[PDB]
Design an enzyme around this catalytic site. Structure first.
Site, PDB file in Angstrom:
ATOM      1  N   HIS A 293      -0.537 -11.487  -4.706  1.00  0.00           N
ATOM      2  CA  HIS A 293       0.848 -11.077  -4.468  1.00  0.00           C
ATOM      3  C   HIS A 293       1.853 -12.077  -5.022  1.00  0.00           C
ATOM      4  CE1 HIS A 293      -0.908  -7.958  -2.080  1.00  0.00           C
ATOM      5  NE2 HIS A 293      -1.432  -8.819  -1.213  1.00  0.00           N
TER       6      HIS A 293
ATOM      7  N   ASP B  28      -3.047  -2.803  -5.026  1.00  0.00           N
ATOM      8  CA  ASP B  28      -2.026  -3.797  -4.627  1.00  0.00           C
ATOM      9  C   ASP B  28      -1.083  -4.112  -5.785  1.00  0.00           C
ATOM     10  OD1 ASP B  28      -2.954  -4.209  -2.032  1.00  0.00           O
ATOM     11  OD2 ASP B  28      -4.165  -5.984  -2.584  1.00  0.00           O
TER      12      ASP B  28
ATOM     13  N   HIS C 129      -9.061  -1.938  -5.069  1.00  0.00           N
ATOM     14  CA  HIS C 129      -8.010  -2.255  -4.083  1.00  0.00           C
ATOM     15  C   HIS C 129      -7.016  -3.260  -4.665  1.00  0.00           C
ATOM     16  CE1 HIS C 129      -5.901  -2.259  -0.387  1.00  0.00           C
ATOM     17  NE2 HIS C 129      -5.756  -3.579  -0.529  1.00  0.00           N
TER      18      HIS C 129
ATOM     19  N   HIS D 214       0.828  -1.227   0.000  1.00  0.00           N
ATOM     20  CA  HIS D 214       0.000   0.000   0.000  1.00  0.00           C
ATOM     21  C   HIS D 214       0.843   1.249   0.000  1.00  0.00           C
ATOM     22  CE1 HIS D 214      -3.338  -2.593   2.015  1.00  0.00           C
ATOM     23  NE2 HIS D 214      -3.052  -3.032   0.796  1.00  0.00           N
TER      24      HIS D 214
HETATM   25  C1  2SZ Z   1     -18.741  -8.153  14.182  1.00  0.00           C
HETATM   26  N1  2SZ Z   1     -17.336  -7.733  14.286  1.00  0.00           N
HETATM   27  C2  2SZ Z   1     -16.884  -6.972  13.101  1.00  0.00           C
HETATM   28  C3  2SZ Z   1     -15.448  -6.472  13.352  1.00  0.00           C
HETATM   29  N2  2SZ Z   1     -14.556  -7.600  13.708  1.00  0.00           N
HETATM   30  C4  2SZ Z   1     -13.150  -7.185  13.878  1.00  0.00           C
HETATM   31  C5  2SZ Z   1     -12.350  -7.377  12.603  1.00  0.00           C
HETATM   32  C6  2SZ Z   1     -12.531  -6.529  11.505  1.00  0.00           C
HETATM   33  C7  2SZ Z   1     -11.722  -6.699  10.373  1.00  0.00           C
HETATM   34  C8  2SZ Z   1     -10.765  -7.716  10.360  1.00  0.00           C
HETATM   35  C9  2SZ Z   1      -9.979  -7.970   9.195  1.00  0.00           C
HETATM   36  C10 2SZ Z   1      -9.332  -8.171   8.234  1.00  0.00           C
HETATM   37  C11 2SZ Z   1      -8.553  -8.397   7.054  1.00  0.00           C
HETATM   38  C12 2SZ Z   1      -7.766  -9.566   6.956  1.00  0.00           C
HETATM   39  C13 2SZ Z   1      -7.009  -9.798   5.818  1.00  0.00           C
HETATM   40  C14 2SZ Z   1      -7.108  -8.929   4.708  1.00  0.00           C
HETATM   41  C15 2SZ Z   1      -6.293  -9.180   3.480  1.00  0.00           C
HETATM   42  C16 2SZ Z   1      -5.484  -8.132   3.021  1.00  0.00           C
HETATM   43  C17 2SZ Z   1      -4.658  -8.302   1.890  1.00  0.00           C
HETATM   44  C18 2SZ Z   1      -3.982  -7.124   1.307  1.00  0.00           C
HETATM   45  O1  2SZ Z   1      -4.597  -6.061   1.295  1.00  0.00           O
HETATM   46  N3  2SZ Z   1      -2.816  -7.169   0.636  1.00  0.00           N
HETATM   47  O2  2SZ Z   1      -2.395  -5.951   0.033  1.00  0.00           O
HETATM   48  C19 2SZ Z   1      -4.743  -9.505   1.176  1.00  0.00           C
HETATM   49  N4  2SZ Z   1      -5.485 -10.502   1.643  1.00  0.00           N
HETATM   50  C20 2SZ Z   1      -6.284 -10.388   2.720  1.00  0.00           C
HETATM   51  N5  2SZ Z   1      -7.171 -11.456   2.968  1.00  0.00           N
HETATM   52  C21 2SZ Z   1      -8.517 -11.323   3.071  1.00  0.00           C
HETATM   53  N6  2SZ Z   1      -9.092 -12.478   3.245  1.00  0.00           N
HETATM   54  C22 2SZ Z   1      -8.145 -13.455   3.202  1.00  0.00           C
HETATM   55  C23 2SZ Z   1      -8.190 -14.853   3.308  1.00  0.00           C
HETATM   56  C24 2SZ Z   1      -7.015 -15.587   3.237  1.00  0.00           C
HETATM   57  C25 2SZ Z   1      -5.788 -14.954   3.038  1.00  0.00           C
HETATM   58  C26 2SZ Z   1      -5.732 -13.572   2.920  1.00  0.00           C
HETATM   59  C27 2SZ Z   1      -6.898 -12.814   3.021  1.00  0.00           C
HETATM   60  C28 2SZ Z   1      -7.953  -7.798   4.786  1.00  0.00           C
HETATM   61  C29 2SZ Z   1      -8.677  -7.530   5.942  1.00  0.00           C
HETATM   62  C30 2SZ Z   1     -10.642  -8.525  11.499  1.00  0.00           C
HETATM   63  N7  2SZ Z   1     -11.432  -8.331  12.556  1.00  0.00           N
HETATM   64  C31 2SZ Z   1     -15.035  -8.358  14.892  1.00  0.00           C
HETATM   65  C32 2SZ Z   1     -16.460  -8.880  14.633  1.00  0.00           C
HETATM   66 ZN    ZN Z   2      -3.931  -4.617  -0.163  1.00  0.00          ZN
END
Ligand code: 2SZ
Ligand code: ZN
Length: 299
Positions: free
Chosen positions: A264, A241, A237, A78
């Site tokens: 990635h 990335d 997004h 980012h």
């Molecule tokens: C009711 N509540 C809501 C709020 N909660 C808290 C909360 C809120 C958000 C998150 C979160 C998150 C998150 C995790 C991973 C990514 C992610 C980022 C990137 C990124 O941006 N790279 O640049 C790439 N991959 C990601 N990713 C998303 N799902 C995935 C599944 C498997 C592997 C990777 C995964 C994005 C947001 C966790 N807890 C508690 C319960």
């Molecule tokens: Zn990202």
């Protein structure tokens, strides 16, 4: 000429690592001509330097990670997309922990931090990498391609898990000649489905994640109170990335990137294949900005 750029001043930001949940101090320091982007871990003795280069990419499952031995710098994409977007060639990035802070989950706060520090044009030509021939990498249904194009254009298609807003897929194309990175891409936040988030948190991952830095979707509904910043924020997004990951080449690209369910890992494999295929690219400078195919904003 199109000049190299650094920051006019040192600037600091504080945040939390998306995956580590650790508080981190981020310092962006001006750097001289032909330095590139260099990350350093200041919380360590001695201080470890890691140039932001494709060869230093280690893990790619959660985000793009830079490695040098057992030393890591996590989630560099980012911040790197913000630098690519603004044309920052030279900078030191000093961190007090392994992971770059997530901020609001987009490149927006980094773009504003850089613009607040001010840009400094340097007396040396900015070097670009021109795509001369098509280069592609595939793995199953995933694909990442570089196509010759006189400018910079990014297309992306994603598959959801599933389905979101009546679609199993989302597509977007951004030609950076007519649409600015700041306006149309920089504010696109990272996202996760609740089912995936519960699994990640069970494994002590995504520790710094919250509705304040990520779009949370519980199956088909956005849980974030104020909704989306763009109707196609998810794919925007992924474009954000890809720009950050592609910046690991060390110089701005002149060409078109097309991503098909690419992440990635495959983005880095595309960079490695391009670097290896020397006949597919060439370094070019523009002594006349007026006729150059990519334009950057005034400093
Ligand atoms: C009711 N509540 C809501 C709020 N909660 C808290 C909360 C809120 C958000 C998150 C979160 C998150 C998150 C995790 C991973 C990514 C992610 C980022 C990137 C990124 O941006 N790279 O640049 C790439 N991959 C990601 N990713 C998303 N799902 C995935 C599944 C498997 C592997 C990777 C995964 C994005 C947001 C966790 N807890 C508690 C319960
Ligand atoms: Zn990202």
């Amino acid at each position: 000429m199109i000049k190299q750029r650094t920051l006019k001043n040192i600037i600091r930001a504080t945040g939390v690592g998306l995956h580590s949940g650790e508080k981190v101090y981020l310092t962006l320091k001006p750097a001289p001509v032909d330095t590139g982007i260099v990350f350093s871990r200041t919380d360590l003795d001695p201080v470890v330097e890691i140039p932001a280069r494709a060869e230093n990419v280690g893990e790619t499952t959660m985000s793009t990670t830079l490695v040098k031995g057992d030393v890591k710098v996590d989630t560099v994409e980012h911040l790197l997309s913000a630098m690519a977007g603004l044309g920052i060639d030279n900078a030191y990035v000093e961190l007090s922990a392994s992971e770059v802070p997530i901020m609001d989950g987009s490149a927006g706060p980094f773009v504003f931090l850089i613009q607040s520090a001010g840009l400094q044009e340097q007396e040396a030509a900015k070097k670009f990498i021109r795509i001369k021939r098509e280069v592609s990498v595939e793995e199953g249904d995933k694909r990442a391609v570089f196509v010759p194009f006189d400018g910079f254009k990014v297309s992306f298609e994603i598959d959801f898990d599933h389905p979101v807003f009546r679609g199993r897929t989302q597509q977007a194309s951004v030609d950076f000649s007519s649409t600015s990175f700041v306006k149309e891409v920089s504010r696109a936040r990272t996202f996760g489905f609740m089912r995936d988030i519960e699994y990640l948190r069970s494994q002590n991952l995504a520790l710094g994640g919250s509705v304040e830095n990520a779009i949370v979707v519980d199956e088909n509904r956005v849980l974030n109170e104020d909704g989306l910043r763009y109707e196609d924020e998810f794919v925007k997004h992924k474009i954000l990335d890809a720009i950050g990951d592609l910046y690991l080449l060390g110089n701005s690209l002149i060409g078109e990137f097309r991503g098909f369910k690419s992440g990635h890992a495959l983005n880095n494999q595309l960079l490695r294949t391009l670097i290896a295929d020397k006949d597919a690219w060439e370094v070019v400078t523009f002594e006349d900005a007026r006729t150059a195919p990519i334009s950057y904003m005034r400093p």
